[PDB]
Design a binder for these strands. Structure first.
Lengths: 136, 75, 116, 177, 43, 50
RNA sequence: UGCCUGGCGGCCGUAGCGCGGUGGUCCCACCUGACCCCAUGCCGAACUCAGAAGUGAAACGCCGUAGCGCCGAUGGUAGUGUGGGGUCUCCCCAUGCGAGAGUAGGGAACUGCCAGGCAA
RNA sequence: UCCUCCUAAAGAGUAACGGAGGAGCACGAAGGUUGGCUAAUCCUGGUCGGACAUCAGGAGGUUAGUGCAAUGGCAUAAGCCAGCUUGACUGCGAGCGUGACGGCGCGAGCAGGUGCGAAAGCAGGUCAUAGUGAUCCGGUGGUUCUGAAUGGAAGGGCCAUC
RNA sequence: CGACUUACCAACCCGAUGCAAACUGCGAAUACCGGAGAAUGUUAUCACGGGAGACACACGGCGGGUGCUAACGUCCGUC
């Protein structure tokens, strides 16, 4: 359950998801799960995808998480009128732009990573694709 | 518990470069020293910059720290 | 460093003279050959300079770096300023205490016609 | 002052020959010595500073100055402003005289003396040591004092490294035990 | 060199048992009784 | 406002006075500052008074 | 005119650091002594004064070295003014402006006034 | 009610029962001037002393500090120390900023009289921005300004202040 | 009193990848202030005076807070 520790502020503005991804290149391992859609991943979703891959590879190779939530998200309690201040924080989400690399794999057969990433992609709300480590 | 605020103090630059000013005119309103007074410019106790002579206000950079200065040219 | 400390000490006066835009008499003191110069407000030009290095000033001083040497150079710069026409000048300690040679130079100029 | 004459006469030649330098003045010189003791019990008993300074003044040739805490530390319940120790600095000829009164008639009278440490070196040309009792100093004779308080001696040199720093110490025939 | 603030620094001669006699400046007092010195010691 | 206010009365015959504030307990001593007296146009000692 | 040095400036990291070499006839620094002027919340440290035996380590100046910092294009990208369109929590087209980062590369400064010594 | 930042969309301004914090003081010195000095955090050595006291050297270069929350500034230091002092002075104040207004802020310069410095110069409180309450009605001091027949006074007025 | 190993925890650092309304060693487009110039506009500008109304706004585009990047929701900036 990835979460920042002792964050500067409990709440933050919603902001916008405009722009373009920055970490668009595979730099740690050999295979990556690029995201071509736009959206945000919750900590619960990230955990679910990670569990799917580590088990699909059956404790083999290395896995790197290239995304962190680092953004509190609030929800008003049920049957609460508007106003009366900002709502409490319930879950943390990460902002993902097209081209951002989410998960990255190494030390596994090329094929095995494909199903492993495919299983992980099945548990995310955004379009994703399979990319390989390019030589510069 | 939030909701408190302070009324705006309307700081900033009042006269911009190349603009003729009269003696005693306020050129910059600032808290610290965004700009340092040069020739014919005085610095008040509030760090306000005022012109000590009639002329055109000019901006430039001097000093080892590349600080920004304001001066008046009598032209 | 000894040198770095002096400039830091004398920086406040130098800036104050610069913004006042007045001719300044700057004095450099060392174990030998005390120096004196007069700098115009612009700062890029020097009107008159005096010191003990000149053979024309050291042919009668027994030693350089003494009150007599300080007074002699003080008189030399004083009369040079008078003949040059400049009258009003502001003394500069240049980070030196106004106690000994610097003081001995200042009063010599003051009594020689360079009041300040 | 005898040692300064001793230092200026031949040991300079010995250092010159030993270190085959291109000039004599590269040889290191002693510039000052400093005495110190961080008593720290000033809060518990404020009026101990007077005797703390008095004894050091007797040991040294001049008056000490009482230092102040550089910061605030909760571990020792002290804050900047409250004196916690005093020190002296010796340089010139007084330092030369003090050194002889140290080497001559101080080290031999060390209670249960075993040997002076040699690993005590900063790494740049400064030597530090400590003492347990003031008896090594003739100014104390068990009659006007009742405290086991100690102090520290730090000697600083113009040396550039340990190799020449130790060589200078060897020239001055330290116990080196 | 400040005056009227430092203790006495008068020169005094001291001798030890092994026969070495020297002279030092300090506020030790009037006379000195020594047994060992830098030399003539079981070092 | 634990610090209270006082009045400084010019030692000269003129009744001109200044006002200021001070902490009685910390410094119960009187104030004898020298200040300008417009009535006589001189700098005179002002004594603290109720 | 040139080799050099000191003082006061312009400009201020292409100008600052690191490593190596080099400088003592002058100048500069260190240095010697300080009974006096002056000074240490103690100390001839610093500051000040009287002098010059010595010397060029330190410091400082100069030269070399890219090992760093630093400067830095062209092209591309991001963004965006105005006008249009769409599968309209975003993007595209026409047109104008155009970074930041990074790359090639540059780079271990230039210059003004005055005084002095050396050699002309 | 007032102060700091964000929201606030690179002049100013800009709302919400929007997100974070403070103030209703303090200081005759912590003010003025002159002179001097320059931190945090680490490494090596060293009686008690040990992670963390003080001492010496080095790295580091403002990560310190700045009476009080925050922002901005500050090596000429606005930061630290000492000497002498009361310019935290009176009457004015061209010309500006800021508000619907009441109002609030900045201010060179002139006159009188002072402090510091050899001197040029600096000083009309504090590194700046919160530390505050209109008018009425009254109290205290000064001033022949007025004082209802006149001479006084009472009471008002003006100035200072509660 | 010398001294040493490590299948094991880990600081300060270095290389690489990110994020920030309350981070900035960088930094636009627009907007705003001032000066000069041509064309054009019934002075479109400012000042003073007489009379007002209005001080419940709504939706759309863009930049945001709030809400669930829900509402023909709510609160701002600009057109």
């Amino acid at each position: 359950m990835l979460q920042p520790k002792r964050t500067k502020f409990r709440k933050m503005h919603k902001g916008r998801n405009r722009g373009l991804a920055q970490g668009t290149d595979v730099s740690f391992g050999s295979f990556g799960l690029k995201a071509v859609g736009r959206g945000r991943l919750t900590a619960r979703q990230i955990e679910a995808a990670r569990r799917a891959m580590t088990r699909a590879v059956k404790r083999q190779g290395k896995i790197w998480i290239r995304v962190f939530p680092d953004k509190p998200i609030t929800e008003k309690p049920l049957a609460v009128r508007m106003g009366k201040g900002k709502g409490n924080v319930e879950y943390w989400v990460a902002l993902i732009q097209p081209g951002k690399v989410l998960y990255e794999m190494d030390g596994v057969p090329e094929e095995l990573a494909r199903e492993a990433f495919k299983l992980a992609a099945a548990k995310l709300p955004i379009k994703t694709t399979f990319v390989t480590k390019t030589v510069m | 518990r939030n909701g408190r605020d302070s009324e705006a103090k309307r700081l900033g630059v009042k006269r911009f470069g190349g603009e003729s000013v009269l003696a005693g005119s306020i050129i910059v309103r600032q808290r610290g020293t965004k700009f340092h007074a040069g020739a014919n410019v005085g610095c008040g106790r509030d760090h306000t910059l005022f012109a000590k002579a009639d002329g055109k206000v000019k901006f430039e950079v001097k000093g080892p720290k590349n600080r920004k200065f304001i001066s008046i040219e009598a032209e | 460093d000894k040198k770095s400390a002096r400039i830091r000490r004398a920086t406040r006066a130098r800036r104050k003279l610069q913004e006042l835009g007045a001719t300044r008499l700057v004095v450099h003191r060392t174990p030998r050959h005390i120096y004196a110069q007069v700098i115009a407000p612009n700062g890029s030009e020097v009107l008159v300079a005096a010191s003990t290095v000149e053979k024309a000033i050291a042919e009668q001083l027994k030693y350089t770096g003494n009150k007599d040497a300080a007074a002699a150079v003080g008189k030399a710069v004083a009369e040079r300023a008078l003949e040059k026409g400049i009258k009003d000048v502001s003394f500069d300690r240049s980070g030196f205490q106004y106690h000994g040679r610097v003081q001995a130079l200042a009063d010599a100029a003051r009594e020689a016609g360079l009041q300040f | 002052a005898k040692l300064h004459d001793y230092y200026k006469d031949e040991v300079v030649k010995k250092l010159m020959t030993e270190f085959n330098y291109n000039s004599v003045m590269q040889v290191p010189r002693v510039e000052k010595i400093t005495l110190n003791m961080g008593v720290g019990e000033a809060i518990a008993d404020k009026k101990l500073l007077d005797n703390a300074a008095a004894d050091l003044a007797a040991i040294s040739g001049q008056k000490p100055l009482i230092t102040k805490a550089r910061k605030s530390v909760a571990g020792f319940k002290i804050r900047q402003g409250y004196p916690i120790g005093c020190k002296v600095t010796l340089r010139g000829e007084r330092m030369w005289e003090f050194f002889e009164r140290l080497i001559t008639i101080a080290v031999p009278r060390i209670r249960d003396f075993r040997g002076l440490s040699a690993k005590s070196f900063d790494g740049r040309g400064n030597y530090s040591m400590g003492v347990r009792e003031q008896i090594i100093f003739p100014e104390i004779d068990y009659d006007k004092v009742d405290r086991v308080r100690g102090l520290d001696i730090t000697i600083t040199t113009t040396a550039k490294s340990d190799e020449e720093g130790r060589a200078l110490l060897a020239a001055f025939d330290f116990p080196f035990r | 060199m400040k005056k009227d603030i430092h203790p006495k620094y008068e020169e005094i001669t001291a001798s030890c048992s092994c026969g070495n006699v020297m002279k030092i400046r300090s506020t030790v007092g009037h006379d000195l009784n020594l047994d060992v010195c830098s030399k003539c010691h079981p070092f | 406002g634990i610090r209270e206010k006082i009045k400084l009365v010019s030692s000269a015959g003129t009744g001109h006075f200044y006002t200021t504030t001070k902490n009685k307990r910390t410094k119960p001593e009187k104030l004898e500052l020298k200040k300008f007296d417009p009535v006589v146009r001189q700098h005179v000692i002002y004594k603290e008074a109720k």
